[PDB]
Amino acid sequence: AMATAVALYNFAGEQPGDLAFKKGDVITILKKSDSQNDWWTGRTNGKEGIFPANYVRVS
């Protein structure tokens, strides 16, 4: 099934297409790369968008 990750920090998701979340939220990964320097794509509590990979820890 899809990868999931725990948010290590808040992210305000302030630009278009971003996913906002809070520390401790469980993010469903829609698509990721193999790198911590990239922008990954996720979903949490009914919204979706992009966020910095290093803000989460894949479970």
UniProtKB/Swiss-Prot annotation:
Name of this chain's protein: Protein YSC84
Induction: Induced during sporulation.
Compartments it resides in: Cytoplasm, Cytoskeleton, Actin patch
Assembly information from the UniProt record: Interacts with LAS17 and SLA1.
Family stated for the protein in its record: Belongs to the SH3YL1 family.
Source species of the chain: Saccharomyces cerevisiae (strain ATCC 204508 / S288c) (Baker's yeast)
Lineage: Eukaryota, Fungi, Dikarya, Ascomycota, Saccharomycotina
Function statement: Essential for the organization of the actin cytoskeleton, fluid phase endocytosis and vesicle trafficking, together with LSB5.
Annotated ranges, domain SH3: 4-59
Superkingdom of origin: Eukaryota
Parent-record interval covered: 413 to 468 of 468
